[PDB]
């Protein structure tokens, strides 16, 4: 059963929802994001010092 939703990009806060199939019992879905990284593609050119 294809179910699409949307979650805000904010850590710590639990995000709750359910899935209502039209003649069955509602299925609850919970997603709590903990740590959301962002890792760029990093390319060393040179180092320097004294």
């Amino acid at each position: 059963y294809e179910h699409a939703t949307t979650m805000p990009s904010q850590a710590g806060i639990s995000y709750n929802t359910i899935v209502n199939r039209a003649g069955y019992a509602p299925l609850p879905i919970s997603i709590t994001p903990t740590k959301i990284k962002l890792i760029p593609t990093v390319n060393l050119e040179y180092v320097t010092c004294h």
Binding site: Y1, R21, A22, G23, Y24
Partner: protein, 49 residues
């Protein structure tokens, strides 16, 4: 099987999206009215009832 003041649960099968039928029970007719919903499977492995 009937008790004195209990409630009897039956199972039925339908094609109706708004089924409504008179249920005969041994002398009398009671009206059963509701709204059916589409099932979850497309192709099943038993014939139609």
């Amino acid at each position: 099987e009937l008790t004195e003041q209990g409630s009897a649960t039956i199972h039925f099968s339908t094609a109706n999206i708004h089924p409504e039928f008179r249920l005969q029970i041994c002398t009398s007719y009671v009206t059963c009215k509701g709204d059916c919903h589409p099932p979850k499977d497309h192709i099943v492995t038993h014939p139609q009832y």
